[PDB]
Symmetry: C3
Subunit: 281 residues, 3 copies
Amino acid sequence: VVANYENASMAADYIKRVSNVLPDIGIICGSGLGKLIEEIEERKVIPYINIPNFPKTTVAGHVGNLVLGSVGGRKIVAMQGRLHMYEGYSNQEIALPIRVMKLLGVRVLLITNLAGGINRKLKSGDFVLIKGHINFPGLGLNNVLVGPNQDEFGPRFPDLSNAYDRLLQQLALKIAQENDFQDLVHEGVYAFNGGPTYESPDESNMLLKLGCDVVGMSTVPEVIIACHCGIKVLAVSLIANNSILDAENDVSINHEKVLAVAEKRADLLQMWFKEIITRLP
Amino acid sequence: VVANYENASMAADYIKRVSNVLPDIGIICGSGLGKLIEEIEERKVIPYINIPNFPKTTVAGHVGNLVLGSVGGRKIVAMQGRLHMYEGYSNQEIALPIRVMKLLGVRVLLITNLAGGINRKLKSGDFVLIKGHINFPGLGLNNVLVGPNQDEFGPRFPDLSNAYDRLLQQLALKIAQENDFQDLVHEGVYAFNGGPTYESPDESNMLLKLGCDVVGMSTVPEVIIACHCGIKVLAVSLIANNSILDAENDVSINHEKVLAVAEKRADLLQMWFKEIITRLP
Amino acid sequence: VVANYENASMAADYIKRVSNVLPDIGIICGSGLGKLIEEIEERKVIPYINIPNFPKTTVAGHVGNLVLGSVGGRKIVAMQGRLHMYEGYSNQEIALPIRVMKLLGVRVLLITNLAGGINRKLKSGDFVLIKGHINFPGLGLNNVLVGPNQDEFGPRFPDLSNAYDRLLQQLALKIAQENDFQDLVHEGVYAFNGGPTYESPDESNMLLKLGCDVVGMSTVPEVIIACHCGIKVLAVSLIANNSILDAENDVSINHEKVLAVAEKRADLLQMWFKEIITRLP
């Protein structure tokens, strides 16, 4: 199934009939960082498997719902269970839910992820406002836009220089200052490691040489599809560990340690993003 | 359809019957840089769609012809509408037209493209003689030769150290000097960005650190197929912008600005390449 | 055919019936470096084509056998004819023979390859104990683990920081010292070039900047599948040439020169690895 205008329209038609909500904000939440979705008001939960043309997700299993409703007086749509390219999903499967968001009316997309720190100023539990990226799959002929262009959504050759909206970064920081946790908030350049293996110690050292501040396995595909079709983006990484320190000390990382950092910061990130949604222009 | 000896031979048989031209020079021209093809003498235009085993190009659309005839007394074959890997074409689809050129008798392939400048000496409207490359798809398991080797055309493990013929670079420069536009002509290393998104500002900064002089989304696949089967190559980039300056000043690039630079230099590039063809040993 | 638990089990059942050998050591030998396999005692040769669910290898041709028997009193299984990803094999085809080794009882995997030198201390004929890697396909969404996770074998997100066992490196060096050829033995970081073209001169220069000591087209996929399922690894590169010196002097590399270096060191590498196998804890 191609992520074209006709197919995205069929999915949006189904959703509109079921939910009655017309959202102008979309959210995609990182693993362990999804509690805000359970607090959406007057909500409607729609399993992916019920939506025409949505990608099949049963091989990987686990949760996969679209959730619509209200947060802070604003109308939103959330992806509960996000699709990652290291699972083997195609470019078309990743893109279609974002293009459905566009047809539903979404103008702003807020994204969180879990990442490794490369910059020596970054500690476990810090947040990074993403200001730019280094897309190793894209340089290497695995960009999410490889294929025919879908002209109704955007141009053949997108410019990504303003993919991460500057005013949304400023608003996120302002709210951190109001609540006295600005000491946790940095900005930086995100390296996309296709995954699913964590960056090796020598890959971490390479990324330091190349000007990367953080590294992770998600987010850049969604950012590119959003930018292509004119949706503004705020993306925030939660730092689980510093990969450069771990390489110097011969210390391992694993998914259990990552999820424990997510639990440690989940409630603060929930409160922060509720207020960002409330305050969006 | 595999780019093997039998399939390429069937396409060459059809072409020979229709054109009567036996070329020893091939040309592939960048977007907006194709006017020379309309000036081929006593020419024959053959739509791709009519040639046995040529790749299907109707999803992307636009022009796609092989053109045979004479330029400056020399017999040539041109691709009018080139195939780019960011459109989703496979390794086999890219390779077959070049291997058909080989079977038709081509010994020299001349290529132009549009590119971004990384080296700080490069300005919009400059030309770069390509002397080597950094192939990010090739390092990342998307080399155009991934697959079975077609032994009739070349070896399993090609050496690319002399892929860009030194004497052809010298001839191109000599002609620029004769016409007093040598101040526009540089040499440099080409980085292949698979595309179709322009390099991000932070990817540009990375490419500067890594010794790249220019960046673009084409050319390296064709160069590798040509070198594999013993065809000499001259490749010239037209610089549309300097990506490093644009990153420092927060200035965007887009396809409209690129095509306007092509129009500005099209007639000079036409004259230059007509004389290169005339003067080839 | 997916490299899952059921399919690997069917292949292991066939092998056990035919060979009666229960190995705890596996070996994969580089091109020209396979003579040890012909000296396995009381051996059993099993063509891949006869084993249920083994990948089809007839397009590439050449030898492809599993060989079981005894070396130095130890029970081993060898791959005679290894699968390389530049031939077009999928992730699933590469992984299944290693997962069969696991089900047969393999706890240690010994690997050799032919490689290019990047570090200026490396000469033709030197050996490099691999201590870490830079996986360009993995960064670029062509990691051997892209796809569904096979949970019975290992975790969704592996840590590769101890993929190259430190005590096995120490044992290999100790044996070199006992036989007075330690002057040939280095340690270093391996860059995976997907291939099949040799690294270009400008790619070599880039790899020097990025902290790579050697470059080659194999090994990292097998290491990752082994680490995922808890198999310890020793990997040794034979240096055929120094790519950085060749770039400064404009000297070519080719497969004939590579195989001649293999022949020059084959008997010493055979003796070394026979003793490593004998001495494994």
